[PDB]
Amino acid sequence: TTPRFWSTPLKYCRWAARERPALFFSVVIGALGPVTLATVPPLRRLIGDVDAAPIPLTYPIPPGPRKQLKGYDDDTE
Amino acid sequence: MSAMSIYIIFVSIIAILFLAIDLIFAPHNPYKEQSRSPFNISFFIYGLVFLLLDLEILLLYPFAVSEYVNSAYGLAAALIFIGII
Amino acid sequence: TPTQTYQFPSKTVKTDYPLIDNDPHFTRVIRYARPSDYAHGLAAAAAGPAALWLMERISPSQVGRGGFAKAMRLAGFIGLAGGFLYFYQRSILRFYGMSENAREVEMDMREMTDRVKAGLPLYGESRLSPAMQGVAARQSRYSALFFGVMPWFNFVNHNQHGVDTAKYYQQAERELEAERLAREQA
Amino acid sequence: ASGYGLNGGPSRCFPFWQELLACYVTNSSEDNPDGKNKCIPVMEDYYECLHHRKEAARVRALQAAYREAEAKKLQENPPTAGQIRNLGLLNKEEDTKKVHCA
Amino acid sequence: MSYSQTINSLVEVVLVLVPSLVGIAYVTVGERKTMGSMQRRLGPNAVGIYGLLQAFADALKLLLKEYVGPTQANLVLFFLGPVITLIFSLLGYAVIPYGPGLAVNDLSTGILYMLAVSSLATYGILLAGWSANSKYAFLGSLRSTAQLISYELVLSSSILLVIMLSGSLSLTVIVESQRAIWYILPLLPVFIIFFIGSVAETNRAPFDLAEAESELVSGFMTEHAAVIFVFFFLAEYGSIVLMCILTSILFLGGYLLISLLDIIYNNLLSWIVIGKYIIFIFPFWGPVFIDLGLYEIISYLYNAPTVEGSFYGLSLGVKTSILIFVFIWTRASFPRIRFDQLMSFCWTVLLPILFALIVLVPCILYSFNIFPVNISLL
Amino acid sequence: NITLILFLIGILGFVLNRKNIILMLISIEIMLLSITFLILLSSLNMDDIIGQTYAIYIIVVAGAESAIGLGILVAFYRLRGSIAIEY
Amino acid sequence: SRHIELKYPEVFSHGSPFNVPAGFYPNLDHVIEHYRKQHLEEEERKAKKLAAAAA
Amino acid sequence: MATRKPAFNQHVLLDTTPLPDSIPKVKEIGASSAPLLSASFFIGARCKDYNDDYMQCKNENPGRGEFECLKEGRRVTRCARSVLKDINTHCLEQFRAHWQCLDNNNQQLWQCRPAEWKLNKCVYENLKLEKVIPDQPKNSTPVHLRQRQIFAHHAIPPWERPFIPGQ
Amino acid sequence: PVPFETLIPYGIIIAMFGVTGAGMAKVRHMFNGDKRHRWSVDQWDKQQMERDRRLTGHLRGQTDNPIAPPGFEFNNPWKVXXXXX
Amino acid sequence: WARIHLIPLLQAEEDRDHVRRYLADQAREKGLLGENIKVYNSDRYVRPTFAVTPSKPAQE
Amino acid sequence: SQISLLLLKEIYTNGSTHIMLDILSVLAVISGICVIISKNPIVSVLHLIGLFAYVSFYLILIGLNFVGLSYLIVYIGAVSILFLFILMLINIRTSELQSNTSNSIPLTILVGIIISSFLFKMLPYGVIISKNDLFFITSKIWDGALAENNHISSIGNIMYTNYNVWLILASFILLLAMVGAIVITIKPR
Numbered sequence A: 001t002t003p004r005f006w007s008t009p010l011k012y013c014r015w016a017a018r019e020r021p022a023l024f025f026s027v028v029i030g031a032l033g034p035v036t037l038a039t040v041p042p043l044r045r046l047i048g049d050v051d052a053a054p055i056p057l058t059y060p061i062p063p064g065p066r067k068q069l070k071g072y073d074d075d076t077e
Numbered sequence B: 001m002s003a004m005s006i007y008i009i010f011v012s013i014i015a016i017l018f019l020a021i022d023l024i025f026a027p028h029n030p031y032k033e034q035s036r037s038p039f040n041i042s043f044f045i046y047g048l049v050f051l052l053l054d055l056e057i058l059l060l061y062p063f064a065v066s067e068y069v070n071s072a073y074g075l076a077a078a079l080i081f082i083g084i085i
Numbered sequence C: 001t002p003t004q005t006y007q008f009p010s011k012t013v014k015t016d017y018p019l020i021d022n023d024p025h026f027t028r029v030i031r032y033a034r035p036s037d038y039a040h041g042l043a044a045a046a047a048g049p050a051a052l053w054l055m056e057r058i059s060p061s062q063v064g065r066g067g068f069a070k071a072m073r074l075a076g077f078i079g080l081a082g083g084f085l086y087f088y089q090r091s092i093l094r095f096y097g098m099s100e101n102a103r104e105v106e107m108d109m110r111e112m113t114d115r116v117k118a119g120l121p122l123y124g125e126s127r128l129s130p131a132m133q134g135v136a137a138r139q140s141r142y143s144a145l146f147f148g149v150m151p152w153f154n155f156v157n158h159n160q161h162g163v164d165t166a167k168y169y170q171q172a173e174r175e176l177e178a179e180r181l182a183r184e185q186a
Numbered sequence D: 001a002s003g004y005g006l007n008g009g010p011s012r013c014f015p016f017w018q019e020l021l022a023c024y025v026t027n028s029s030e031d032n033p034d035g036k037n038k039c040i041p042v043m044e045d046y047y048e049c050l051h052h053r054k055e056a057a058r059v060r061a062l063q064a065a066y067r068e069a070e071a072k073k074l075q076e077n078p079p080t081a082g083q084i085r086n087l088g089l090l091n092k093e094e095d096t097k098k099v100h101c102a
Numbered sequence E: 001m002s003y004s005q006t007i008n009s010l011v012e013v014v015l016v017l018v019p020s021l022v023g024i025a026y027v028t029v030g031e032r033k034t035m036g037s038m039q040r041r042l043g044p045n046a047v048g049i050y051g052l053l054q055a056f057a058d059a060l061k062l063l064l065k066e067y068v069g070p071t072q073a074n075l076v077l078f079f080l081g082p083v084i085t086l087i088f089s090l091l092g093y094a095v096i097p098y099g100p101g102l103a104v105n106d107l108s109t110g111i112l113y114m115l116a117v118s119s120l121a122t123y124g125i126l127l128a129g130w131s132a133n134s135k136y137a138f139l140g141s142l143r144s145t146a147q148l149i150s151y152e153l154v155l156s157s158s159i160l161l162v163i164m165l166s167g168s169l170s171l172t173v174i175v176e177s178q179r180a181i182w183y184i185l186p187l188l189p190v191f192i193i194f195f196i197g198s199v200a201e202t203n204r205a206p207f208d209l210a211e212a213e214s215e216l217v218s219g220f221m222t223e224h225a226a227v228i229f230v231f232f233f234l235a236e237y238g239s240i241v242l243m244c245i246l247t248s249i250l251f252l253g254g255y256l257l258i259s260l261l262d263i264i265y266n267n268l269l270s271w272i273v274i275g276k277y278i279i280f281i282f283p284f285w286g287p288v289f290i291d292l293g294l295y296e297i298i299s300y301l302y303n304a305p306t307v308e309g310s311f312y313g314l315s316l317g318v319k320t321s322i323l324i325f326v327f328i329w330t331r332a333s334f335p336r337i338r339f340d341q342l343m344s345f346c347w348t349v350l351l352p353i354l355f356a357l358i359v360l361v362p363c364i365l366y367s368f369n370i371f372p373v374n375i376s377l378l
Numbered sequence F: 001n002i003t004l005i006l007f008l009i010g011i012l013g014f015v016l017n018r019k020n021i022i023l024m025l026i027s028i029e030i031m032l033l034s035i036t037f038l039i040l041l042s043s044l045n046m047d048d049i050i051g052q053t054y055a056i057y058i059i060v061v062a063g064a065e066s067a068i069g070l071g072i073l074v075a076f077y078r079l080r081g082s083i084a085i086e087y
Numbered sequence G: 001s002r003h004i005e006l007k008y009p010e011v012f013s014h015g016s017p018f019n020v021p022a023g024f025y026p027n028l029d030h031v032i033e034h035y036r037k038q039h040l041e042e043e044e045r046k047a048k049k050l051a052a053a054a055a
Numbered sequence H: 001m002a003t004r005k006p007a008f009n010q011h012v013l014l015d016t017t018p019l020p021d022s023i024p025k026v027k028e029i030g031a032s033s034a035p036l037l038s039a040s041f042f043i044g045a046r047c048k049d050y051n052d053d054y055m056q057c058k059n060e061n062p063g064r065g066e067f068e069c070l071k072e073g074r075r076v077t078r079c080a081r082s083v084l085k086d087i088n089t090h091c092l093e094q095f096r097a098h099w100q101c102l103d104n105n106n107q108q109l110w111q112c113r114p115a116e117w118k119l120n121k122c123v124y125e126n127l128k129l130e131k132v133i134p135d136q137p138k139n140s141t142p143v144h145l146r147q148r149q150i151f152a153h154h155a156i157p158p159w160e161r162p163f164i165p166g167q
Numbered sequence I: 001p002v003p004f005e006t007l008i009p010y011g012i013i014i015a016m017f018g019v020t021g022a023g024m025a026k027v028r029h030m031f032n033g034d035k036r037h038r039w040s041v042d043q044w045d046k047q048q049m050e051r052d053r054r055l056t057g058h059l060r061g062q063t064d065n066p067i068a069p070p071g072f073e074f075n076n077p078w079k080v081x082x083x084x085x
Numbered sequence J: 001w002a003r004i005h006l007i008p009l010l011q012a013e014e015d016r017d018h019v020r021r022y023l024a025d026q027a028r029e030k031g032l033l034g035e036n037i038k039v040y041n042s043d044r045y046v047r048p049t050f051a052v053t054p055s056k057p058a059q060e
Numbered sequence K: 001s002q003i004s005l006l007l008l009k010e011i012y013t014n015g016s017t018h019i020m021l022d023i024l025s026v027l028a029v030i031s032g033i034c035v036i037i038s039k040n041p042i043v044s045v046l047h048l049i050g051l052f053a054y055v056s057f058y059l060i061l062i063g064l065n066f067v068g069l070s071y072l073i074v075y076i077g078a079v080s081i082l083f084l085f086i087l088m089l090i091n092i093r094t095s096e097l098q099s100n101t102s103n104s105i106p107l108t109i110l111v112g113i114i115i116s117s118f119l120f121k122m123l124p125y126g127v128i129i130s131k132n133d134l135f136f137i138t139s140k141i142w143d144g145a146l147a148e149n150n151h152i153s154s155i156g157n158i159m160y161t162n163y164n165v166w167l168i169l170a171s172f173i174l175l176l177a178m179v180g181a182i183v184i185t186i187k188p189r
C-alpha cells in the first residue's frame, strides 16, 4: 500500500506530504536552509546588494609610521 | 541593598504569612491517622531524551548571542553541530 | 612588493619536495589534480561496493528480501565518500610537498605570478574578517593529513599559506621587465 | 595563556605567556643547551601574573609598615567621609582644601 | 542617586508584587466569567457587587480550612514544600520590563533566568504528587512531570529562534528590537508552537489528562493532598499569567504601542504658528484647539514620566489579557488529549519542525546580511 | 578551600558505602562538581574564558555519564529486582 | 632532545581581536624572523637536494 | 588597579598624593558624559591625528605605554579642550539642547535627531567641522541623516530636516 | 449583546499593569534626579556615570564646562574588595 | 565610532592617574621600608592587584 | 600632612557583601554532609539538589551567571529529575542499603587527613587568597570597555570557531549516550 522511496521516488514524496506532513516538511524546511545559503547570496551580489562593512569592535589603529604631529604642546596649555 | 534581594525576601514574607493564617486560624486536630510492579521503561526515555536534547540546545544559546562575530565560519560549525545532534 | 611576504609564524615540516601551500583552497586542489588522481579515486570508490558484493557471493548473508539492496546503498555512499577523500588527498599532498610535485610547482608559479601582474590579491578576497581568516587557516593547515579520522576542506580566501611569497613577486618583476624591453625594441 | 578574556577582550596574563614563548623559541635550540636559562625570569613573571604571590608578599609588609607608622603619629583633624565625597566638586572648594591640607 | 537604594528597592518590588497578586486573583474570577459567557451562563456574580470578591472568599475559605495531610515522617515537606513552589512561581516576575529598563532586575541573561526558574516547576508537580498514596495516581504525577520536561524543550528551543533575531537575552532588548516589527509576523509558526507549548507546559487543559486521571482512581480508602492549600493555586494561576506576559514580550510588541503620533506627522502638513493647526487632508479644516488651555497642557502630559510609563504598561497589560483570553477559550473549546498522544505531538511533530527551523533561520539571516550586533545597543 | 572540601565529601561517599550503588552514582557527581567548581573559580582569577568553556564541557559529559549510568542501572534492575549488595 | 619545537607555532597568532587595549600585544617580529629563516633554510635544503641529485 | 569587574566592593581608596613636578601638568577635561557624546564626532574631526598618534605611541611601546606616552596624552586633552571650548563659544544653545536630550534618551543618538541636526548646522557654519561616520554602506541614506528613525521612541516630525552640508 | 460583566476582571488586570508601569517610571525618574533612567548599561556606561559623579557628585549629573574643577585629578575612585578577584 | 573619538582622552586621564598612584606608592615604600621590592623582572607596568589601605575608613 | 591614602565607603554603586560567600560555603558543606549520611536515597538526591543550588548561587554571586544558570538548568533541571524518576520507581528497601557506618569512622579520619594535607598544597595562591589583610584593588579602562561582551557572548565568539573540535567530540559523546542508552533499555518494536 504505502510506497517505497527507492522504487518510486516521486510517488513516495506525495504520500509523505499527505500522510506524514510534519515529518516530510521538516526535511523540506531543513533543506531550504542549505538552498537559501547557496542561492540568495549570489543573486544579492547580482542586484548590487553589497554586504555592509563590519562594525569596529576594537580601537581602529591606522597602519604605517607615526605622523610626527606638531600642535597642542605644553607651551600652548 | 540591591532590588533582587529585597524582592525574594518580600515574596518569602508573603509565603510565610499564608502559613501563619493557616497555622494560627485553621483548626488543628491532633489525630493525624507493599507490592511490586514493574515500572515502564518509557519514563526513563522521557528523562534521557530530554537530558540530552536539553544539553544540546543549551550549547546553541551562545551561538545566538554571538552571531555577528561568528558570521559564515561560525554558522558552518554550528550547522555541523546541529546536523550531528 | 608588500614589504612583508612572511607575515605569520608557520610550521616547517621535513618533507622531500617543495611546499606550494599549507592550506590550498578546494578549487585549486581540484584544479591541479592529474588524471591519475581520477582513476585512483574511482578505483577505490567502486572497491567498497564491490567488496560487499564479492562477500555476499562467496559467503552469503542469508538476509531477507530487501536487505542487500539497503546495504549496497550504504556501501556505495561510503565508496563515494572514501573515494573522493582519497582523490582529494592524493592531489593535496603535492601542495604539502609530501608527493612529487614538479608539475604543480610550475602551474603554481605561473598562476600566482599571473595574479600578481593582474593586481589580484595572491590568494583571493575573503568575506571573513582578518581574524576569522586566521582561525580558518589554523584549522585547515595540513588537515588532509587527518582525513582518516576527520574530514575538513578549505573554502576561505585567507593569505596564510606557509610560503614566503617574495618569489611570485620577484618573478613577476623579472617578467614585466622582460616584456617592457620587447615593446621598446619594436 | 588562552588569549581570550571574560569581557570579549584578551586575557590579562597573555602578554607574559607570549614574552615567555618568544624567549624559549628564539634563545633555546639543540645547538645551545642553556639558552632556555634566559626564560627563567620570564617564566617567573608569567607565574607571578597568574598567582600574585610576590606582590601579595610585598604589599603585606608595606601595609604593615604604614599601618603602625600612621598609628603613632599625631592626628590633627581626620577628614570625614562626607568631606572626601565632596572632593573636586565645583561648589565645595572648602572641603577640597581641607582634604589636601593646602 | 536622589534617595536611598533600599527605599527605591522596596517601592519597585511592592509596585510589581501587589498589582501582580491582585491580577492573579482576578484571572481566577475571569476564567469562570468567560467560560460562562461561552457556555451561555453567568460567572460568579454574587460574592461582591459583580462577583468581584469571589477570589477573595475562595482564598480566605481555604486558608481557614483544616488540613489533615500526613505530618508524619515528613514535617518540613508537608509545610515548607509548597511554600517555595509559590516562591518559584513569583520569582519570574522580577525580570518583566514595564517600559524600557523598567524592571526589578534589568538582566542581560534575563531569558536564561526565566529558563532556570521554569525547570524548577517540575519539582512542584513531582513532589506534591508524591504525597498521595495510590499506585496509579503516583505514576500520573510522573507522567505530568514527563509532559512538563518535553514541552520545556519546545519552549526553550523556540525561544532560541527569537534570540537569533534580537541578538540578546535581555527582555528589554528583545522588545526594543520589535520596534521594527513584531516577531509574530516573520516567526508566525514559531509563535503558534510557543503558545501551544505554553499551554502544555502549564499542565492546562487540553493537555491535563495525566493529572486528571488521579481523581478517577482515588478509591475508597485514600485521597489527595492539594486540599486546603491556596499555594499550588496561586503557583498555577501566576504561571499562566507569567507565560502570557513572556509570550507577549517575545512575539507581540511587549510594551510597544503602535504610536499614532507618527501617522499624524505624515498626514499633517499645514503647520501654523498661530495655533490653528490646519491639516492638508480631505476631511480636514481649521481646528480651534486652545493654545493657552489645551495644547500647552496636552503637550506636557504626553511627556510626563507617569503618563508614558502608564501607556507602556497598559499596552503590555492589554496584550497579556488578550492571551489570557486565548488560554480560557482553549480550555472551553477542546476535549482532552491522551498522554501518549501529547507525547507524540511534542516529539514527532513539534520538535522536528522546530529543529528544521533552527537550521533555516540563521541560514536566511546570513543570506540577507541580517545578523544583529551582540554588543549593548538598544 | 570549598572546592577541596566538596571533593572530600565525594571521596567520603566512597568510604562509607557498603550497600548503596546509588550513592556511588551520587558521589561521582559531587566529585565532578568539585573539579568544575575549582576550574571556574581559577578562571575568574586569571580572566580566562577557556576555564569557563572547559566547565561547560565537563557539565555536558557529566550529564551523559548520568544517562549511561542510569541506563545501565535500569538494565541491571530489570533482571535483578534489587539494587542491594548482599554483605 | 632537551629542546621542544612547538607543533603549533601558530599560537603566536592567537589572542582576541576585540576590546584590545593599546600596547597590550607584544612586538613579535623577532619570532616571525625565526620562522622565516626556518622556512627559507628548509626550502634551500630540498632545493639543493633534488636539484643537485637530478643531474 | 586591575581591570577586573568588581563583585563585592564596599569601599573606595583615594590617593591625595600629587603627580610629580617633573611631568608637565595639564588642565583636565571637565565635560560630563552626555556633553562628550554630543561633541564626540566634532572632536574626532579635529583631533583624530592626535588621538591616533597617542594610541600608536602606546602600541609602539608595549607594557610601558602609560609611561613614555605622557606627552601625547597631554596633546589629546588639549585638542579636545579646544573643541569643547569652541562649541561653547558659538553653539552653546544648540549644544545644550542636544546633550540634555541625550540625558533623557539613554544617551542613544537616534533618539534626539532634531537637536543633533541643528547642532551640526551651527558647528559646521561656525567651526567648519562635520560629523562623519567611516565605512558606512553605499546603497542607502546614512543612518544619522535619515528622515525616519525606526528605533526612535518618539517620531521625528517631518519639518525637522537632516543637515546636509550644502543645499 | 456584550457581556461587560465578564469583561470587568480583564479591565482590572489592564489597570494593574498600567499602575505598575505608571508608578515604576515615576519612582525611577525621581531616583535618577528627575531625569529619565538609564537601561541597557554596559561597563562603559557605568564608568561614564562614575566620572559624572566625580565631576558633580551625582551619577546622573551633567556639566558642559571645558575645564574640570580643582581636585578632579584625585577623586578617581579605585574600588577595594576583600574576597573576589 | 562615537566611543572611539573619546577613548584616547578618557584613557589619557586614566594613564596620568596610573602614573600618579604608581610613583606615589614607590615613594611611600622607599620611606617606609627603606627600599623598593621588585615584584616583576621586567620594566612593564602591571596594574596593581593589591593595595595598601588604612586600617580604618572615615568616621562617616 | 594628613594621611595621603584615604579609605571611604561606596554610597550607591557598591556591590555585594563577601559574607554571603561564607554562608553559601557553610550550607554547601552542610548539604553535602547530609548526602553521604542520609539513609534514604530519595533524601540524598534532595540534599544533592540543595548542594547544586548553593554552588549555583555562589557562582552567580561572583559574576558567572551563564554557567551558574547553566548548572541550574542542567543539574537541578534535568539530571536530578532523571535520578528522581528512577529512584521513585525502583523498589528500595531502605534497610538493605544501610551499612554499619560506625566502623568506617577511623578510615574517614585517616583518609581525610592525608588527602587534605596533600591536595591543598597543589591549589594556586589566588584560590586560597581568603591583623593586616590584603585588599584587592580595581580601576576602570576605556580602550578595553568599547564593546564589552557578556560571558556567554565571549564563550560563543570562540566556542564555534577556534576551539570547534571540542564541539565535535561533545556532539559525538551526546550522540553515543543517545544510541547506547536507548539500545540497552528498550525492547525493539
Ligand SMILES: CCCCCCCCCCCCO[C@@H]1O[C@H](CO)[C@@H](O[C@H]2O[C@H](CO)[C@@H](O)[C@H](O)[C@H]2O)[C@H](O)[C@H]1O
Residues within 6 Å of the ligand: B020, B023, B024, B025, B026, B027, B028, B029, B030
Ligand atoms: C513559623 C512562624 C511561627 C509559628 C506561627 C504559627 C504558630 C502556630 C501555633 C499556634 C496556633 C496553634 O493552633 C492550635 O493548635 C492547637 C494544638 O495543636 C489546636 O488545639 C486542638 O488540639 C489540642 C491538642 O492538645 C486540644 O487540646 C485543643 O482543645 C484543640 O482545640 C488548635 O485546634 C489549633 O488551632
Ligand SMILES: CCCCCCCCCCCCO[C@@H]1O[C@H](CO)[C@@H](O[C@H]2O[C@H](CO)[C@@H](O)[C@H](O)[C@H]2O)[C@H](O)[C@H]1O
Residues within 6 Å of the ligand: C098, C099, C100
Ligand atoms: C605488525 C606491524 C603493524 C604495523 C601497522 C602499520 C603499518 C603501516 C604500513 C604503511 C606505511 C606507509 O606505507 C606507505 O604508503 C604510502 C601510500 O600512499 C606509499 O608511500 C608513497 O606516498 C606517496 C604517494 O601517495 C609518495 O609520494 C611517496 O614517495 C611514497 O612513499 C607507500 O605505499 C608506502 O611508503
Ligand SMILES: CCCCCCCCCCCCO[C@@H]1O[C@H](CO)[C@@H](O[C@H]2O[C@H](CO)[C@@H](O)[C@H](O)[C@H]2O)[C@H](O)[C@H]1O
Residues within 6 Å of the ligand: E024, E025, E028, E031, E032, E039, E055, E056, E058, E059, E062, E230, E233, E234
Ligand atoms: C485567589 C487565589 C486562588 C485561591 C483559590 C481560588 C479558587 C480556585 C478554584 C476556582 C477557580 C476556577 O476553577 C475552576 O472552576 C470551575 C467552575 O467555575 C470548574 O468547572 C466545573 O464546573 C463547571 C460549571 O459550569 C463545569 O463546566 C466544569 O466542567 C466543571 O469542571 C473547574 O473544575 C475549576 O477548575
Ligand SMILES: CCCCCCCCCCCCO[C@@H]1O[C@H](CO)[C@@H](O[C@H]2O[C@H](CO)[C@@H](O)[C@H](O)[C@H]2O)[C@H](O)[C@H]1O
Residues within 6 Å of the ligand: E085, E088, E089, E092, E114, E115, E117, E118, E120, E121, E124, E125, E128, E155, E156, E201, E202, E203, E204, E208, E211, E226, E231, E232, E233, E235, E236, E238, E239, E242, E243, E246
Ligand atoms: C520557558 C520560559 C518559562 C518562563 C515562565 C516560567 C514560569 C514557571 C512558574 C512555575 C510555578 C509553578 O508552576 C505551576 O505549579 C502549579 C502548582 O504546582 C501547577 O498547577 C497544578 O496544581 C493545580 C491545583 O492547585 C492544578 O489545577 C493544575 O492542573 C496542576 O498542574 C502548574 O501546572 C504549574 O505550571
